[PDB]
Design a protein around this ligand. Structure first.
Ligand SMILES: *C1O[C@H](CO)[C@@H](O)[C@H](O)[C@H]1NC(C)=O
Ligand SMILES: *[C@@H]1O[C@H](CO)[C@@H](O)[C@H](O)[C@H]1NC(C)=O
Ligand SMILES: *[C@@H]1O[C@H](CO)[C@@H](O)[C@H](O)[C@H]1NC(C)=O
Ligand SMILES: *[C@@H]1O[C@H](CO)[C@@H](O)[C@H](O)[C@H]1NC(C)=O
Ligand SMILES: *[C@H]1O[C@H](CO)[C@@H](O)[C@H](O)[C@H]1NC(C)=O
Ligand SMILES: *[C@H]1O[C@H](CO)[C@@H](O)[C@H](O)[C@H]1NC(C)=O
Ligand SMILES: *[C@H]1O[C@H](CO)[C@@H](O)[C@H](O)[C@H]1NC(C)=O
Ligand SMILES: *[C@H]1O[C@H](CO)[C@@H](O)[C@H](O)[C@H]1NC(C)=O
Ligand SMILES: [Ca+2]
Ligand SMILES: [Ca+2]
Lengths: 377, 383
């Protein structure tokens, strides 16, 4: 019957295996094909290209090759510089670029052929601050990994002039093994209330150091910025009495979503991560392939065209497809998906709020930008 | 005699005239040609391409065209996304990419064919903090414009856990005309000690609002993050008693450098100045002094590589330039006294981390020098 091709560009270091993102992409396409409710008369196909991390030149070439084969969208690469380059290309040729990871939005940038499935920083920033205020903290130490961490917490960093939060800002070193001297200063400083802005792998690492340092006890409360908090091996810490709170956008309470995360798990020792948990970077890619497909269903006329980066001739159906994608609505692995009319950023979404109880990490409320917290005391 | 071609890629909105950067580039090339000490037997030529702001796709195309014509270096474009794209291309074809503006350095990025003439943020961050500590401030309000402002002041933002600075962080709105409500909060807050992290055009704008608000008086001390502080019309404020302190990397005290900045104003000031700006007309900004210095520093390297010639390279093919590796190495080793002082790059990352700043403050006479800073000495205030 009818057939439509998507492009995929996935970043990696060294060689195989496949990464989580390229896996979720393929997995979503195979699933959707078998669904008879979604794209009934339509069958999805794809080209996948692998590139080095941070080689925007290679990302450009591969994106141009794919636009030449003909594709209805490029689920372009993850990291800032390659992603900005593929987005500029996609904008010139009017093919939608689908992103799954946050990158810094420049105001005066006029690209319009992209949406991003990642929960926008502005909203996450607020939900961190909302949580801090619910715990009634007046003192807090924000610890971040790299520059861009600062940006994800700007709403929080600007609070000390409106509300009554004194706050200290510290930076992690490159390696978490180097983190004892930093943690010792926090300990002497009596900094019991701490937000860690860093990847979930960094968080697994910094917790081990915190244990060694006598800082996983009932005296300490740690808020985690990472959405992959639920991926952390928490067996070493649940009996200790520490408080760990963070957020989760992966909708694991829904039974339909649990069964999908399982089929995924089916297809390291010193990590401190659970093995075979579906991370957020990958649930988002899988959701992106669905949301875009909901749009394809509403545009049966559309077909791919072989476009050449040489020539300034855009894709006929681009403008209309891009518009359908931005209007799309979908219940996926990561809850309500809905983009912002204005900038194509996902600014409205649903978070579960999770905390460490002796039983493990469990849900204790919700957050959404219109309600603030809905804690279930 | 011998001839060498440089490439230039300059960003703009709408159409002409030429911008400061493209002008300083051309001006540097014309000057160097006439110098008989620098590149005596060598004559510089160039291709210039103009692109839209934030169109990395177009920047890629124009860079590829230039590598095809054949060029010994691309004085690639200014803004993050286009600059990162031209840098990746330049790295694959082993032609040096010369930058004049800061952009965020990703650690795990392996590009090695570039240097940056802009004074690195890490060092500027420290010199801000050094100054604050010399004024013995224990309280300070940092006001920034956009996200990346945060990064330029990270050294400062992390101080409140080592030293004894309480500090409040506020953000400007998009337009400075919208800044009264923010300034009113600072006034009620008794925030007399304030660092403005923002462009010099924003700073000219925010000062007018501060005057309106009764905040240009002896009670207020403003430290300015911008290196183009010296470009601000200061006539409205010097009689008032406010304290304005900032830094300047443009070496205006040197007589040779003053005469060069003048010849610039004559061909430039000749074209459009503005009345309601709050900037002096025809002052050479830092963005442009750096481009002009970049063309010189790179030339000092060309003098030491007479064998070198340009090759027509194709982005199609993975075949780099023979002379690239050696030229890039000569550039990173180069040393030069230009409009912006000692130029010297960091062996490690090709970033300009060691440089000399004049420290300037508003006296009734105007903006004047009151010391110096360099990363190895801290402040050398001349009391
Ligand atoms: C496809 O199938 C699953 C169950 O087999 C269903 O839950 C899902 O909603 C279907 N897709 C659509 C868009 O209805
Ligand atoms: C996106 O639009 C939302 C409405 O959902 C609006 O409240 C908000 O201002 C926009 N987000 C951003 C980051 O501008
Ligand atoms: C929070 O509560 C209100 C009603 O009390 C509800 O409308 C809103 O959807 C709740 N948030 C979530 C995520 O359910
Ligand atoms: C502060 O302002 C007064 C009056 O303009 C001036 O005498 C003094 O030199 C200034 N202080 C500094 C830091 O230069
Ligand atoms: C396929 O959609 C339904 C079957 O699910 C069918 O009735 C319809 O005619 C087909 N769609 C098109 C566009 O022909
Ligand atoms: C911290 O609070 C959580 C609720 O979020 C509670 O379940 C836990 O017992 C507390 N930690 C301890 C044991 O002090
Ligand atoms: C070229 O001449 C100018 C003055 O004419 C001088 O300042 C400059 O240093 C000269 N170049 C060199 C490297 O000697
Ligand atoms: C450049 O390398 C790092 C990063 O800026 C810095 O620590 C070092 O001191 C610099 N090297 C020199 C020679 O100044
Ligand atoms: Ca199907
Ligand atoms: Ca000459």
């Amino acid at each position: 019957t009818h057939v439509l091709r998507f492009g995929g560009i996935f970043e990696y270091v060294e060689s195989g295996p496949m990464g989580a993102e390229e896996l979720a992409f393929r997995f979503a396409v195979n699933t959707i094909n078998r669904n008879r409710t979604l794209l009934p008369n339509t069958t999805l196909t794809y080209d996948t290209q692998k590139i080095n991390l941070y080689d925007s030149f290679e990302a450009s070439k591969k994106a141009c090759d794919q636009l030449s084969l003909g594709v209805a969208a490029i689920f372009g690469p993850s990291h800032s510089s390659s992603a900005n380059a593929v987005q500029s290309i996609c904008n010139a040729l009017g093919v939608p670029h689908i992103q799954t990871r946050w990158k810094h939005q420049v105001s005066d940038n006029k690209d319009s052929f992209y949406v991003s499935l990642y929960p926008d920083f502005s909203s996450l920033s607020r939900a961190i601050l909302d949580l801090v205020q619910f715990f009634k903290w007046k003192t807090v130490t924000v610890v971040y990994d790299d520059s861009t961490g600062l940006i994800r917490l700007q709403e929080l960093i600007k609070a000390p002039s409106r509300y009554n939060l004194r706050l200290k800002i510290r930076q992690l070193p490159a390696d978490t093994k180097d983190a004892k001297p930093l943690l010792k200063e926090m300990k002497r400083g009596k900094e019991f209330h701490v937000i860690f802005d860093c990847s979930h792998e960094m968080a697994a690492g910094i917790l081990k150091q915190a244990l060694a340092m006598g800082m996983m006890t009932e005296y300490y409360h740690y808020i985690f910025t990472t959405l992959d908090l639920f991926a952390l091996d928490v067996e070493p810490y649940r009996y200790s009495g520490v408080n760990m709170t963070g957020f989760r956008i992966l909708n694991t309470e829904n039974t339909q979503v649990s069964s999908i995360i399982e089929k995924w798990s089916m297809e390291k020792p010193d990590s401190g991560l659970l093995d075979g948990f579906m991370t957020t970077d990958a649930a988002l890619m899988y959701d992106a392939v669905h949301v875009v497909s909901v749009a394809v269903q509403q545009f049966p006329q559309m077909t791919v065209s072989s476009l050449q980066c040489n020539r300034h001739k855009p894709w006929r159906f681009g403008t209309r497809f891009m518009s359908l994608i931005k209007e799309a609505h979908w219940e996926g692995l990561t809850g309500r998906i809905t983009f912002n009319k204005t900038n194509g950023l996902r600014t409205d979404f649903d978070l579960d709020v999770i905390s460490l109880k002796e039983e493990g990490l469990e849900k204790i409320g919700t957050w959404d930008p219109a309600s603030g917290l809905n804690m279930t005391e």
